[PDB]
Structures are given as C-alpha cells and as structure tokens.
Amino acid sequence: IVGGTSASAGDFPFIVSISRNGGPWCGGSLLNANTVLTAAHCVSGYAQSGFQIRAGSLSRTSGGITSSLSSVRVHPSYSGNNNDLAILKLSTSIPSGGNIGYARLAASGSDPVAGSSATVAGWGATSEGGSSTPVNLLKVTVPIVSRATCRAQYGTSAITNQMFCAGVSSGGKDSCQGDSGGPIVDSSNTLIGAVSWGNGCARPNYSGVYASVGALRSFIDTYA
Ligand SMILES: [Cl-]
Ligand SMILES: [Cl-]
Numbered sequence: 001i002v003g004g005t006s007a008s009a010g011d012f013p014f015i016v017s018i019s020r021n022g023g024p025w026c027g028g029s030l031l032n033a034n035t036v037l038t039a040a041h042c043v044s045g046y047a048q049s050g051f052q053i054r055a056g057s058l059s060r061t062s063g064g065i066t067s068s069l070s071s072v073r074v075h076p077s078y079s080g081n082n083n084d085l086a087i088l089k090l091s092t093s094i095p096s097g098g099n100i101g102y103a104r105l106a107a108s109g110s111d112p113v114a115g116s117s118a119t120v121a122g123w124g125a126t127s128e129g130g131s132s133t134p135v136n137l138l139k140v141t142v143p144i145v146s147r148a149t150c151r152a153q154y155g156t157s158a159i160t161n162q163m164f165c166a167g168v169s170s171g172g173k174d175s176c177q178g179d180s181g182g183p184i185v186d187s188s189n190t191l192i193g194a195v196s197w198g199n200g201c202a203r204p205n206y207s208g209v210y211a212s213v214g215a216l217r218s219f220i221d222t223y224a
C-alpha cells in the first residue's frame with residue numbers, strides 16, 4: 001500500500017496474509033472456516049506447499065491463526081490478467097470470533113460506481129519497486145475510476161467486465177506488489193474485489209485494477 005495508513009484491529013476481520021516460502025507474497029479474504037479468496041496470479045501453477053495463510057492478525061508474521069493449503073482452484077476462464085481470482089481450501093479450519101470474521105460479498109452482477117469510495121488493504125510495498133514491506137497491515141481509500149476512463153488509461157481490451165479500477169488522477173494512493181489477492185471493500189466494508197494489477201504503483205493516470213467480486217460471484221458461490 002502506497003499512501004496508506006495503519007489498519008486498526010478488526011477493520012477487516014476476514015483479511016489474511018498469504019506468505020510464500022516464509023516471505024511476504026499476497027493477501028486474501030477468508031470466506032468461511034476453510035476457504036480463502038485470492039488472486040489467481042498469487043497461486044496459479046506454484047507449489048501449494050509454499051503457502052501459509054494467517055488470519056486474525058495485523059501482523060503477517062505473528063499472532064492469529066495459521067493454515068497450510070489443501071487445494072487451489074483458479075477461475076475457469078483465468079487468462080493473462082483476466083478473471084484473476086482463485087479459491088483456496090485450508091488444511092486447518094479457522095473459526096470466526098474475536099478479530100476473525102468471514103467476508104460479506106458484493107451482490108452478484110453489481111459493479112462499483114465511479115466516484116464511490118473504496119478502501120484497499122495489504123502488506124505490500126509502500127513504494128513502487130520497494131523491497132522492504134511493512135509488518136503491520138496498511139489501508140488506503142481511493143475512489144472508483146469508471147471502466148471507460150480506465151480503458152482510456154490501459155486500452156479497451158485491457159480492462160474487461162470482470163475488472164474494475166480505483167485510484168486518484170494525481171497518483172500517490174494505490175495497492176502495490178505484495179498486495180495482490182487482498183481485499184478492496186466498499187464504504188460499508190463489503191468485499192468488492194481483490195487486488196489484481198496495474199502499471200506500476202500509485203502513478204498519475206494509471207488506476208489500480210481489481211478482479212470484480214460482483215462480476216465473478218458464480219465462481220465464488222460454486223466453490224466456497
Ligand atoms: Cl468509448
Ligand atoms: Cl485527483
């Protein structure tokens with residue numbers, strides 16, 4: 001997260017850090033006791049044994065409850081940046097309670113409205129190409145950017161109906177490397193997406209691009 005602030009305890013009861021080979025990697029969202037939603041690119045074709053999930057903590061390295069993976073299912077239409085979601089099943093079920101909770105999801109067929117305020121959270125770099133990552137969870141609030149404006153930024157084919165965009169024209173507030181797969185929420189804390197991709201981080205006139213939960217609910221509901 002670039003231009004972020006510290007997440008408070010219980011801000012995103014469902015957020016998970018996804019470590020790989022013991023180091024930072026991605027984020028995720030706990031859908032239920034044995035299931036995490038993340039970005040396909042966080043996991044697709046990698047050794048599953050490499051991943052560890054941690055829930056119920058603002059730290060990625062200590063506290064809360066952890067789990068290895070039992071399986072990984074990518075979106076059936078995952079291709080390049082498109083349909084960038086994956087369902088992980090957990091080896092160890094994680095109960096709700098305390099600072100752990102399950103995500104509520106954007107309605108099927110919903111699409112974030114331009115100018116509405118979204119909040120995105122992670123343990124990614126606080127600058128583009130940053131090699132140091134914060135221990136504690138950061139968050140930033142940025143407005144939804146219209147698909148039409150985002151297509152003017154990235155090209156028509158680049159931004160699909162299963163993506164939405166968010167950011168500020170000026171830059172300076174965005175998700176970055178290490179934030180992939182983690183939650184972006186509407187003003188109500190409903191899960192609207194997962195961190196997916198973009199042109200660098202926090203650049204003027206290049207929105208963050210997110211995999212749309214509203215657009216990809218059949219996949220999520222079928223395998224959660
Ligand atoms: Cl047009
Ligand atoms: Cl602006």
Ligand SMILES: [Cl-]
Pocket residue numbers: 215216217218219220
């Ligand atoms: Cl779907």
